[PDB]
Amino acid sequence: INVEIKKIMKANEKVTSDADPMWYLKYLNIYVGLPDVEESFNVTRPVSP
Amino acid sequence: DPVEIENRIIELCHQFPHGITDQVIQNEMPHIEAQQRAVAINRLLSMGQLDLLRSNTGLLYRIKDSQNAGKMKGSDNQEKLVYQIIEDAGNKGIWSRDIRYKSNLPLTEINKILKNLESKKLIKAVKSVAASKKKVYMLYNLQPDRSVTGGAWYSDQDFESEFVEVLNQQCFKFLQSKAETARESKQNPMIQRNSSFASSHEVWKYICELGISKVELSMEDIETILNTLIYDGKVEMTIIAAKEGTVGSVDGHMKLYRAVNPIIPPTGLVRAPCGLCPVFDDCHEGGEISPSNCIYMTEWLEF
Amino acid sequence: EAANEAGDSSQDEAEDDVKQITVRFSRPESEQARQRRVQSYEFLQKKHAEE
Ligand code: SF4
Structure with missing residues (x-):
């Protein structure tokens, strides 16, 4: 989660389609953050195991 | 200076739109050796402003089609890089899907190119009568091939069954009258x-004297109609040897057609409901489909 | 072998094999296909022969 995920994201950092050139989707940096629960309406909250 | 040589070759190509051979270039510019002319031609071909043709007289160098422009909005590069295969297709035409796959361009760009070319009268879109799926694009100057589109039988991508039926009936009546006169x-x-x-x-x-339809019917069309009649088991054709005459269609051969009666009348099998039954396979003595409770034979005996 | 196939007959009539204009599209090559072409052995051999 600290090293290998970043390498995987870098291996596929750029994705583009053949049609309509000059269009692309570039990934910059990926984060995992702390554990949270999606119970609240559009709000996160710390949850214990 | 090779630039001057290239410019002079381009001017000579402009003077002769049909192409120029090496002899013409040598006569116009004799003070230059053959190696320099070859290098100039190689550079001209590398930069993409000339095309090579191999005729019975040798090699011809023609200026690439750039003056004939229908899509000037944007870049002439794609204009010519579409018109190239448009012309290559020519009479046989080519569907929009095939143009897209050959151009390796999105659908919007090729649609824009086709619209702009049609605006300045360079390409015509005709509906493929063989497979009415899309409209094939062809050169405006070329005549549409009968196989890919048009035809004496097809009218607006619709086969005229009534027309061919009337043709067959009239031809059979004429042949029958001729055979009756011959017999009498x-x-x-x-x-x-x-x-x-x-x-x-x-x-x-x-048939031309009859004038049933307005479309002109060629000799091969009536030949195909008579072949279809032969396939109907109603006429007979024979190929006789004749060098030249009022027909002059086939070299040393002439096809003569005559109305002939069938070989034998209808057979006995067809006179029974069992022979024309569509569920004949499921016939069985004891079951739902039995000859005792058959509806076909019932209606046949009642009639 | 080609010469023999051609001389299969004693006198060969003038063949009407005029080279139709088979000028293919310089299709825009996909980046993957372009890299494959660059990494092809024929391309490297031609580049070496250019010198
Ligand atoms: S349904 Fe009757 S008439 Fe028809 S095939 Fe069977 S037995 Fe013959």
Whole structure:
């Protein structure tokens, strides 16, 4: 989660389609953050195991 | 200076739109050796402003089509890089899907190119009668091929069954009348058979005199109609040897058609409901489909 | 072998094999296909021969 995920994201950092050139989707940096629960309406909250 | 040589070659190509051979370039510019001219031609071909043709007289160098422009909005590069295969297709035409796959461009760009080319009268879109899926694009100057589009039978991508039926009926009536006249003449068996015979040109002129439809019917069209009639088991065709005459269609051969009666009348199997039954396979003594409680035989005996 | 196939007959009539204009599209090559072409052995051999 600290090293290998970043390498995987870098291996596929750029994705583009053949049609309509000059269009692309570039990934910059990926984060995992702390554990949270999606119970609240559009709000996160710390949850214990 | 090779730039001057290239410019002079381009001017000579402009002077002769059909292409120029190496002899013409040598005569116009004799003070330059063959190696320099070859290098200049190689550079001209590398930069993409000339095309090479191999004719019975040798090699021809033609200026690439750039003056004929229908899509000037944007870049002439894609204009010519589409018109190239548009022309290559030419009479046979090419669907929009094939143009897209050959151009390796999105659908929007090729649609824009086609619209802009149609605006300045360079390409015409005609509906493919063989497979009415998309419209094929062809050169505006070329005549549309009958196989890919058009045809004496097809009218607006719709087969005229009534037209071919009327043609068959009229041809059969004419051949039957001719055979009846030949039989009634009873002058001599060989003369009778020769008179009952009808050449393709004769029946074609007869149909033309009738004038059932407005579309012009060629000789091969009436030939195909008579072939279909033969396939119907109603007429007979024979190929005789004739060098030249009023037909002059086939070299040393002439097709003569005559109305002939069938070999035997309807057989006995068809006279029974069992022979024309569509569920004949499921027939069984004891079951739902039994000859005792059959509806076909019931209606046949009642009639 | 080609010469023999051509001389299969004693006298060969003038063949009407005029080279129709088979000028293919310089299709825009996909980046993957372009890299494959660059990494092809024929391309490297031609580049070596250019010198
Ligand atoms: S349904 Fe009757 S008439 Fe028809 S095939 Fe069977 S037995 Fe014959």
